[PDB]
């Protein structure tokens, strides 16, 4: 469960400072408010659990809350739906991160006058770390289990309206890691669906016992949010003192903040590929083991997250409103769709899944509206994102529609070809241009080669050069007054395609691409030649050939 | 002139400013010896431009600073100075963009404030104006020109050892703009050298004029730098009291310090063509006309000026000296190269050629020789960067020599090719496809169609559809257990190489190109095929071929 419930997990490091800060407001004597807002939560949490554990039942190929927000209303909620997980994802990483540099400054309080940069680094590598492609991302999910645990029972040992409803929102913030089973269900083992639905219910079991505890102590210690440090610090500074095991437990919570942004990472092209399955992200996404969108996606996250983190300056606490909304509108969606799925059917458990879903939906949609009406100053970002990117996915999903409709029919074949040209533009008579007019004289004839030379002098010595070559083949030197290479190519290419035209020939060319074993000789070589390609080759309707002459 | 003249001619903008500062440090009572400094700087001048002008003379082509120190001396000091003159044209923008945003908070000071934005925002917008392609380049330097003329005639009216060499060095760091004309001779009329030589000696009459004129007003009015100004605006304010007028000498410096950056920019790819034309630089930049590497460059210059006007804070003070290091290593190269063409060559005039240049030349390395030690903080930049781009030159033209011996050496012809395999990956038979295998079969024949699914219902469903289809081709369906595109057909890949090669055949691929008039549908469109061609058809020995499939 660990790769999957790192987010979860690691929510308790900011849920109750959350509630805590919401609460701070009125006085430090309305902490007491903070006990049973949480274990309403809890309340919450336990529908959200006992919901999702419908939706691994109800889908066991994985659908999270886009399938079943999808099949379920419509196109426009489908969408919607997967704008808000996206930009889950986008809060889930910059809040994780924010966390966990906002961890390591309270373990470091000289590291935090560099909150953003440190923030910053620490995006970078998990982008790096998820850019070259395990065992590693579960020991420190057992090990902040572990930890806290310890620190409850350790803290148990020792200590012995409309305001409450913002409070109430603030910390259902701590409840977003819960779609990540529900997106990985198909990861499991012979029974997926059974198995899911059992380790949910131990992450719901486990989440709500940290998040109880931390509350708890937050309660008994009467402990107040500083700017300084996390209330989970807090907790541990004044139970350990600042011990090697408060360095622990500060250590680690960074380390599951770090690995819930990894997570929210990686999981973002299981949504890119739901969706492009269903034409509304590019088809490159398609092809999901193959890692095609996956470099893509991992770059447009990361920048977002940086964005998101340079924008709030870091500060958790401005950013928890925006990941709240992010994880509650796939929420309240799924919980409808869910609901609108029993209505629709009428399986045996019928009340109580509607009554169960019902609650789930109408307690998310109160949270994410009282999120709107509060804290608008810092959810404007999803008023202005959700437009776009659902515009944005309306746009791919109209234009492949169109693609669709203007390919899918089969039409009269074009007329028959009856030979090709095959210019072979040569710079200098070596080896590489040997190769290419070789294979150019093997695929077909009128192999015309062509130079085009910025010296009359050099031009004369290269054609004397080529007589002297013995490759049958015709080379037409063309003289370019000043440094160019586009406009005499091109005035030449219509004069060749007119006449293939006139003897119904199919114009190609051959752009041998010298390669390298160097990974940073391709700016140096044979980028001549995507100057050709992107010119005047790719808007010509004519065959553009490349041949990996390798280098040794 | 004006529009190679812009970045002399507005150098004086900072000139007198640098002396002031530099003499700044004693007592403000020394601004006395900033009258005969600036003589001096003039003397150095007449020097500089004379040298200059025999180089148009001697190289008509036009070659700068670093053909005639690398004709005359050799490999290693004409490299030392094309990477010179490269970190000059990048201080030429970085000092250009700073003195401009200065002299915009002089005219607005509730900009200096920010100040570095937009100093990053001009840099920018030189950039956009530069990567997309005159006569608005000419009037800015003529109006700075008359602005300053008109200046000092006011003035007038209105008028009527070791730290003494550190301010002759940063106020030579006042002629920098002396290369332009050296370098763009071949923009000029019939007589190219003598008009050449012409327009330089009425540049260097001009600075000289407008250098004097403002050192001399300086000197009149006791004016001191502060940070908030440059002097020359102290200069208008005190004559003209911030009217309409002052206004207008702000705007106009602040245009033709934005044009003189303009310079540098469009001046850097002479720079790049002349050294690799010489095989230092990628061979991409030998089409100057054009413009392949322009857009490479403008983006490196760009980027290296953002990186070093923050860095160093936009304070051109601070950037002055590394400008003044970067100009003055290719005029002590460019004069000892001088000096040494004339002592191997025996010419009418010999012994003045001489002289001058050597007066010059002990000048200009005393100059920048003051400038290592004196402002060694901010000019260990060149000392960083000079070994790295001088190595890196090198080990492009070490590289280009070894293509070279392993390529100009044409050896037996290959083994002779009987016929060509064409694999025609397809998605799904639409119209692209049936063009694709139409020109396919069109090549040659064994036309192998391969379609990679990802599902067992759906590829019998796509064989079904493909057997309906007319074309007589051979396809294989390759079914892959989990989403991916490459390990199946690299084997499919191997098994058909392995074939082609008993049967002693090429092979070949098509991968048609679906181009869309709309500039980012290119995302969406064809982004599974770049996939093949990096992955498994660049490593393989294999043609390549891309069929533009226009969109309609
Ligand atoms: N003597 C030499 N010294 C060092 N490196 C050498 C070399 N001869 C070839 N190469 C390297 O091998 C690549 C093969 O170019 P090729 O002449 O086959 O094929 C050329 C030709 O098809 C076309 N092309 C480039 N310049 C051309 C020109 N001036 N006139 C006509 N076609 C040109 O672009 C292709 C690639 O041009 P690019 O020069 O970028 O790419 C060259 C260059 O990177
Ligand atoms: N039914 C449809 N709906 C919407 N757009 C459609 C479409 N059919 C084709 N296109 C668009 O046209 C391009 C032409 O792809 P084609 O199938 O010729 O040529 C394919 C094929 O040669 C290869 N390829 C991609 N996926 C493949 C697969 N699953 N199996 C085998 N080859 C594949 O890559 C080439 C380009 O693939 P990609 O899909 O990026 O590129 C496709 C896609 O952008």
Redesign the pocket.
Same mark, same amino acid.
């Given at each position: 469960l660990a790769m999957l419930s790192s987010d979860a997990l690691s929510s308790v490091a900011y849920g109750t400072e959350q509630i805590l800060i919401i609460l701070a407001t009125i006085s430090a004597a309305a902490f007491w408010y903070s006990i049973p807002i949480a274990v309403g939560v809890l309340i919450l949490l336990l529908a959200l659990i006992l919901s999702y554990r419908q939706i691994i039942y109800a889908y066991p190929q994985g659908g999270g809350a886009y399938i079943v927000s999808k099949e379920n209303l419509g196109e426009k909620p489908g969408l919607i739906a997967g704008g808000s997980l996206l930009v889950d994802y986008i809060l889930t990483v910059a809040v994780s991160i924010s966390a966990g540099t906002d961890a390591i400054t309270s373990a470091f309080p000289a590291l935090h006058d560099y909150h953003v940069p440190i923030a910053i680094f620490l995006v970078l590598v998990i982008m790096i770390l998820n850019l070259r492609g395990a065992s590693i991302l579960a020991y420190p999910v057992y090990l902040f289990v572990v930890a806290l645990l310890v620190l409850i029972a350790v803290g148990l040992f020792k200590l012995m309206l409309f305001l409450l409803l913002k409070a109430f929102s603030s910390g259902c913030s701590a409840l977003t890691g819960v779609e990540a089973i529900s997106n990985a269900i198909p990861a499991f083992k012979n029974p997926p669906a059974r198995n899911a639905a059992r380790t949910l219910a131990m992450m719901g079991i486990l989440l709500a016992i940290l998040f109880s505890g931390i509350t708890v102590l937050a309660y008994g210690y009467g402990t107040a949010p500083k700017p300084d440090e996390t209330v989970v610090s807090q907790i541990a500074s004044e139970t350990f003192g600042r011990n090697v095991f408060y360095y622990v437990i500060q250590g680690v919570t960074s380390l599951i903040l770090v690995l819930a942004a990894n997570t929210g990472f990686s999981a973002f092209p299981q949504l890119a590929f739901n969706l492009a399955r269903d034409q509304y992200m590019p088809r490159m996404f398609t092809v999901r083991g193959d890692r095609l969108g996956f470099s893509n996606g991992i770059i447009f996250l990361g920048f977002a997250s940086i964005v998101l983190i340079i924008l709030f300056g870091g500060q958790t606490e401005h950013l928890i409103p925006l990941y709240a909304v992010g994880v509650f509108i796939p929420f309240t969606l799924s919980q409808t769709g869910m609901c609108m799925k029993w209505i629709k059917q009428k399986p045996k458990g019928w009340i109580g899944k509607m009554l169960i879903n019902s609650c789930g939906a109408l307690i998310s949609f109160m949270v994410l509206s009282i999120l709107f009406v509060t804290k608008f100053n810092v959810v404007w970002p999803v008023l202005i994102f959700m437009p776009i990117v659902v515009l944005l996915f309306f746009a791919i999903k109209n234009h492949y529609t169109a693609v669709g409709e203007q390919l899918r029919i089969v039409d009269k074949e074009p007329e028959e070809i009856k030979g090709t040209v095959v210019i072979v @533009? +040569? #710079?200098?008579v070596?080896t !590489? +241009?040997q190769k *290419?007019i070789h294979y150019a004289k093997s695929l077909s004839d009128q192999v015309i080669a !062509? %130079? +085009?030379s910025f010296d009359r002098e050099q031009e004369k010595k290269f054609e004397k050069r080529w007589e002297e070559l013995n490759n049958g083949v015709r080379l037409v030197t063309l003289h370019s007054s000043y440094r160019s290479?586009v406009h005499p190519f091109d005035k030449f290419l219509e004069t060749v395609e007119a006449k293939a035209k006139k003897e119904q020939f199919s114009v190609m060319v051959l &752009? @041998?691409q &010298?390669i390298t074993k160097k990974r940073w000789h391709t700016i140096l %070589?044979?980028? *001549? #030649?995507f100057l050709?390609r992107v010119r005047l080759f790719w808007k010509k309707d004519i065959m553009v050939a490349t041949l990996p002459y390798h280098f040794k």
């Open positions: @533009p +040569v #710079a200098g070596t !590489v +241009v *290419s !062509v %130079h +085009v290479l &752009f @041998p &010298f %070589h044979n980028q *001549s #030649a050709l």
